[PDB]
Design a protein around this nucleic acid. Structure first.
Ligand SMILES: [Cl-]
Ligand SMILES: [Cl-]
Ligand SMILES: [Cl-]
Ligand SMILES: [Mg+2]
Ligand SMILES: [Mg+2]
Ligand code: NA
Length: 327
DNA sequence: CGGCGTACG
DNA sequence: CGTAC
DNA sequence: GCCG
């Protein structure tokens, strides 16, 4: 009744089991902070199953037969159904480890391994990190300086303004080039932690060398607070606000038009949706999927796709619009 | 038990 | 090591 | 942690 891969089922942005999925996602996050990738994936997948259900889970029997619910995930749900709280989840939430790893990994430039090393050195607060800049990269320095703004949700209102500004620079860098909104906003989210754009040009090959030209133009307009031949840029942008401005994370990616469907699919996400789709591709269909293409390793050939619809058809999956990829 | 997505900066 | 979905 |  419920297929086992998230790419086999529609997952809307808002759903009927918000509280249950949020709890499982706490345990998933905590597993990641400990390096337990398998447990992170199971808890993420169990959470996603609940997002795909057509109505609220009210009784434990409704978990019977659902993929990715075993003893542990089912006990979490049972406790939430019976008591409104799961003791394990609440213990994680208030733990010094969870709170500090979350605070540290939320920094742009800091991943689990860096956060964990700082944790073991006894560091606990952003001010702890500011006092020891000897230990910070230029990227991490930027992430820490801008941390407060970057912690403030980006709004869909902000996105339209940013896109016009990116389009202006893109059009000077390469007339005819296009800018497409991707990531969470393309899936219908009303706010986000960053804004994701995919850039291409209708004439194959004309996109070569494009992103340095775009970045130089944005920098000359005073709009770049931070950035690093390249085709992906992870920037911090200066975004107007009434009488002031705020820093916003923006990701720019260039793809040749031949690869655009694959890049659009990949950069539209969700992150879990894409991992599940690539796992499905490889394990169920024997095809290797990434944001550049879809490879048949028996015939040693790449599938040509003109659309995301083509890619779903290639993989034998019913098409899901971006708004239903919120796994 | 093995597997757990796959890229670029 | 970090980044992205 | 769960699937196959
Ligand atoms: Cl694990
Ligand atoms: Cl300004
Ligand atoms: Cl990729
Ligand atoms: Mg995003
Ligand atoms: Mg992004
Ligand atoms: Na980070």
């Amino acid at each position: 009744w419920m297929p086992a891969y998230a790419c086999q089922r529609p997952t809307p942005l808002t759903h009927h089991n918000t509280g249950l999925s949020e709890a499982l996602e706490i345990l998933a996050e905590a597993a990641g902070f400990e390096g337990s990738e398998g447990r992170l994936l199971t808890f993420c997948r169990a959470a996603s199953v609940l997002k795909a259900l057509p109505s609220p889970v009210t009784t434990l029997s409704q978990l019977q037969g659902l993929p990715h619910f075993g003893e542990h995930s089912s006990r979490v749900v049972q406790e939430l159904l019976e008591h409104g709280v799961c003791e394990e989840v609440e213990r994680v939430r208030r733990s010094e480890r969870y709170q500090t790893m979350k605070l540290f990994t939320q920094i742009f430039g800091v991943g689990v391994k860096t956060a964990d090393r700082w944790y073991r050195e006894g560091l606990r607060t952003l001010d702890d990190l500011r006092e020891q800049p000897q230990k910070l990269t230029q990227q991490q320095k930027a992430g820490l300086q801008h941390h407060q703004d970057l912690s403030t949700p980006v709004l869909r209102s902000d996105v339209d303004a940013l896109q016009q500004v990116v389009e202006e620079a893109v059009g000077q860098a390469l007339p005819g080039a296009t800018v497409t909104l991707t990531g969470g906003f393309r899936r219908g989210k009303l706010q986000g932690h960053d804004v994701d754009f995919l850039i291409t040009h209708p004439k194959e090959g004309q996109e070569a060398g494009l992103l340095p030209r775009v970045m130089c133009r944005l920098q000359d307009q005073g709009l770049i607070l931070y950035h690093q031949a390249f085709e992906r840029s992870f920037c911090i942008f200066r975004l107007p606000q009434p009488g002031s401005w705020k820093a916003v994370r923006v990701d720019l990616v260039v793809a040749p038009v031949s690869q655009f469907p694959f890049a659009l699919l990949g950069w539209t996400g969700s992150k879990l949706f894409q991992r599940e789709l690539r796992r499905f591709s490889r394990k169920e269909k024997g095809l290797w999927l990434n944001s550049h293409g879809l490879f048949d390793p028996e015939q040693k050939t790449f599938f040509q796709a003109a659309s995301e619809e083509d890619i779903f058809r290639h993989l034998g999956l019913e098409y899901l619009p971006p708004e239903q990829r919120n796994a």
